[model samples]
Target chain A: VNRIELSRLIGLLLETSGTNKIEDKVTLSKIAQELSKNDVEEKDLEKKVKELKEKIEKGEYEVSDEKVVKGLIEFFT
Target chain B: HMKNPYSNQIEREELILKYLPLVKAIATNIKKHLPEDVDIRDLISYGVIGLIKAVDNLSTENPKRAEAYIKLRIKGAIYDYLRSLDFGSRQVREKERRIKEVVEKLKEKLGREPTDEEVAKELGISTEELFKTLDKINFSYILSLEEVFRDFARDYSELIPSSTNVEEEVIKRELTEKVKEAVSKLPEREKLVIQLIFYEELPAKEVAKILETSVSRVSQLKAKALERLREMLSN
Candidate 1:
């Protein structure tokens, strides 16, 4: 599960779970297993996100608004 | 044996700088639909973090891969930040939920997607009020569901014990089928959005332009359609 694949999977799961009614244990379990295979367990992701935030706070992470429009054209498009 | 191409701090910083435009790109697009008070600068700030993460995590071997994955993560970071703000009141969420419930029930009873009038009548709100509610909700449904999706993908693995049982696979397959069926059953607009956005790899902005509607409105429909699918698959 590379990030691109993981990204698509996230999109699908979100698309399917809109009303929070995905109560099927089996379905949920499969989703969990899939997430595990991707190495994106909750705690791990949270830790990574935290690290990212810390870097941002330390001026490690770094931005445009017509170039933004252009990227927007490609970002979602 | 070879040094990782991404090992150099200066080079990675260059990579991050190169893609910084993506942060503004996503922020500008999302900001168009957001309230004026929702600062684009904030979105850009979050997106910068995402871009940095992308540069850090991307494979050193594939520039194409880096391009795709980095943009995805950058946009994701921006979206996550927007959702964290917890915009809209509780009442707005309740109304959004109510709308879904009414639509779901009416669909079950009518054997098809119900008209706006039908849904409004079921909810005891006028059509005008329903649209007003949808607009006032300010696209929260779309953002909320994405939050659910991201959280689940990120953390759900920890919740379930490991299992390779035959029964688990069977259930998984069944649910996968159901998702396809649910997608197939989606209303024309919803189906088109899914296909264009997910299958065809078109962006929401492009999809909106093609469909001759505003991006925010398209987002609402996508959210509503997904809500309906969730109900159908669950029930």
Candidate 2:
């Protein structure tokens, strides 16, 4: 595909990464059959993420100043 | 065999020179978001060629439409250059994989998300190096994914191998499923960042506004979350 369509496809792959947009029905196999680039792959996550997720899911994970500050420093550091 | 009056060499050449500065203006603007090393002179040269082709194919009498078409042509020409630059970008790919693998190992052993410093430590690269790498990946991704490139790729025909085979299809499905599961379990802000970026298809700057944070923070969140996804997908 050309760059524009390729961009759209890339965006679709990412935006539709986890969710199934049956309405869109833009399956990977159709476009994907024409695309393949093998790169990297690897091993392993802590269970704590599940615990963190559950807390957030349960409405216990507040968007605090502390968390925002912490998150920025953690990843942006 | 005679062409439009505009196609005469004198008129076409005049149009190109008149907008020659326009070429540099567009090139300057385009160069703003690009990396430092791409020469603006080269961008201008390619854009001048774009002007020639545009004027050569001229059909419109309306200067407004003509200028608009010319502007887009110049940008498209520049994007073609950018695409070529990305070819064999094995270095970015390599560093990206290295970072992803390190993140996976760290999160597995540390039992929590690691800091940029922590990840850099594992990669044996400086923290600044990790930061720049993350920026490069995100910028390259966004740049390569710009939505307006249609005219050039119509005949590209760069078809890759079929991944529709049943065995790989099953594997792909599980990869998607497991990543979704892991995404749901991230820290709340990280989860929101992932949702806005990947699920909502919003730009990082827009996502940052929604979260009332900076773009770098959003990039970091994405990098962190993707680290988790790659980790899950890898095993």
Candidate 3:
């Protein structure tokens, strides 16, 4: 719902980002991870996301602990 | 729902208890960039007030958004206290003024921006001392960065809600290219500063050392580059 607007806002937030935006991602996933890492429901999300990241990294797929991978993807490729 | 969180003891207390760790995390993160003499405990105390206030205004349905607002409030609270402290020493402040004076005189006299080397010579100081002063300026400049982000947040006030399906791919691809295009078009030093700070995650001190300048100059370039990016992003 708001993800699109958020994703866009996040992109804009990178300006003067310093550690704040980086911290934003870090803290976000850390909270996500800590919500009991969200059952296997969460694990499935991580597992799926991690698979894609490894795949993209190895020329198999496109997108870490969730936050950083998003940032690197957002910033790098 | 007693007291509606505005006066509800249980809801407010539970929310505060659950998020107490966040206050510590933020305080610890901020301490990394601050002086050792600054008491971490004091920052945590300031952060807790923010956390409580976050609870006061917090809407219960959206914890994720609550988290963002909580972090924002806590960080801003610390920043407010830091600003109130009236940071910086007199000599460093005076030196910054002197550097500005020389840069101006040199700009007209040389018909261009004065080199750091030239500024240093005019100030009768070594490049190292000039860098030291500039480093202090960078440290001080952090206070100003808060305002920029605050304005940025205000501009993005409507950024919330998640539809049933969040279509990220096309948006990501489009932004990916546009952001890259914008990033690459920056002035050289500005680009390098972005590279080091964003990519390498290096400190301004290291960036200054690598660039053979001061953190203040790196910081200034960063501010300019950020504004330039806003122009580019809007276009």
- Highest DockQ: which candidate? 3
> lDDT of all the models against the reference?
0.54, 0.53, 0.56
State which candidate has the highest TM-score. 3
Candidate 2 matches the true fold with a TM-score of 0.42
Estimate, for each residue in B20-88, the C-alpha lDDT of model 2 and write its tens digit. Answer: 657666665455334445666667656655666777776765576577667767766766667677622
**Candidate 3 residues B1-235, lDDT tens each?**
3456344655565676567667766765565446545666667666766776777877636666678777777887877777777455677667767766777788799776666678788989877777656655544654554554455444333344231214433443454565566666777667766555545444555555555554446656765665566566566
The list of candidate 3 runs beyond 4 A from truth reads A1-77, B1-8, B35-37, B87-94, B97-136, B158-185, B198-201, B208-235
RMSD (CA, Å), each prediction: 19.0, 18.7, 14.0
**Order by TM-score, highest first:** 3, 1, 2
Model 1 stretches astray by more than 4 angstroms: A1-77, B1-7, B58-60, B94-138, B148-180, B189-223, B229-235
Task: Give the alpha carbon lDDT tens digit for every residue of B1-235 in model 1.
Answer: 6667546754765575566555655666565445545656567656766776777666545465457567767768878777666555788788777777776787689786676667678888876676556544645644654554454334422322243446545644543454555555667666655555544344454555555555445556766665665465455
DockQ for candidate 1, please give it: 0.02
lDDT ranking, high to low:
3, 1, 2
Alpha carbon deviation, residue B70, candidate 1 (Å): 1.6
| TM-score (all chains, Cα) for each model | 0.45, 0.42, 0.49
List model 2 lDDT by residue over A1-77, tens digit each: 52344344434543443565551234333222222222121111123334544565686754443333333222111
- Docking level of model 2: incorrect
